[PDB]
From Swiss-Prot:
Protein name, per record: DNA polymerase II large subunit, 1st part
């Protein structure tokens, strides 16, 4: 059983293996993943129903493709993919990825890609960006430091400023279940069902997007994806030793 075959049985949808083989040979893994996203959303594997069902299938299949079907991120790592609104703000629709505890079993590269995939899927679906309030931002700043010190040292420990930067710019909501019982300071935030620590979301953001930024930028180039200039500049600044 090859990569394409692993993907069909891991996440589906049924029939996707044949299409992946055909598209990978002609386009390479990265572009093939995005054309699969397009075909799923366009209904080539069935009318899936609600935008959310399209979103879930597209995220998981695309991420499976890009991680070669060798990690559990597309399955156990992501609890669910949800469409939500910026109620505090303009009530605009945006995508959210809920990461479960076992996202910690996928590396930072797969964690980073799930976010990039997230973005591409929400655009294809016509969704707006997540527009976290100030409280969402500060909640994450708080969670990152708290998890670092009292749950598990982060392989990449972003400064508070790095967390803000990532929060102001990442166009989907990185969030999840509570993975660890540690009550938080900034509590009852509109879109945040838990007042405990979101371990899955914390890793994906620190060890994923920020730690694997350079690697992610390369996928962004290989895929011709727009809208991530801020991550290009973040990488560039960190290598040069220029301030954020």
């Amino acid at each position: 059983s090859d990569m394409a075959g692993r993907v069909e049985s891991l996440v589906g949808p049924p029939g996707v293996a044949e299409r992946i083989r055909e598209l990978v040979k002609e386009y390479g893994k990265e572009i093939a993943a995005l054309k699969i996203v397009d075909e799923i959303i366009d209904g080539k594997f069935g009318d899936l129903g609600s935008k959310e069902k399209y979103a879930e299938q597209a995220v998981r299949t695309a991420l499976a493709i890009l991680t070669e079907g060798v990690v559990s991120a597309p399955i156990e790592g992501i609890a669910s993919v949800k469409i939500k609104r910026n109620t505090w703000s303009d009530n605009s629709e945006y995508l959210a990825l809920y990461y479960a505890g076992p996202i910690r079993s996928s590396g930072g590269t797969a964690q980073a890609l799930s976010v990039l995939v997230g973005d591409y899927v929400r655009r294809k679906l016509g969704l707006d960006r997540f527009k976290p309030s100030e409280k969402h931002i500060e909640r994450m700043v708080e969670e990152v430091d708290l998890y670092h010190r009292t749950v598990s040292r982060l392989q990449y420990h972003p400064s508070p400023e790095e967390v803000r930067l990532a929060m102001r710019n990442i166009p989907i909501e990185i969030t999840g279940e509570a993975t660890d019982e540690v009550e938080v300071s900034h509590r009852d935030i509109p879109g945040v069902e838990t007042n405990q620590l979101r371990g899955g979301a914390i890793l994906v953001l620190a060890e994923g997007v920020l730690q694997k930024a350079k690697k992610l930028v390369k996928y962004i180039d290989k895929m011709g994806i727009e809208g991530w200039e801020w991550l290009k500049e973040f990488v560039e600044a960190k290598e040069k030793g220029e301030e954020i």
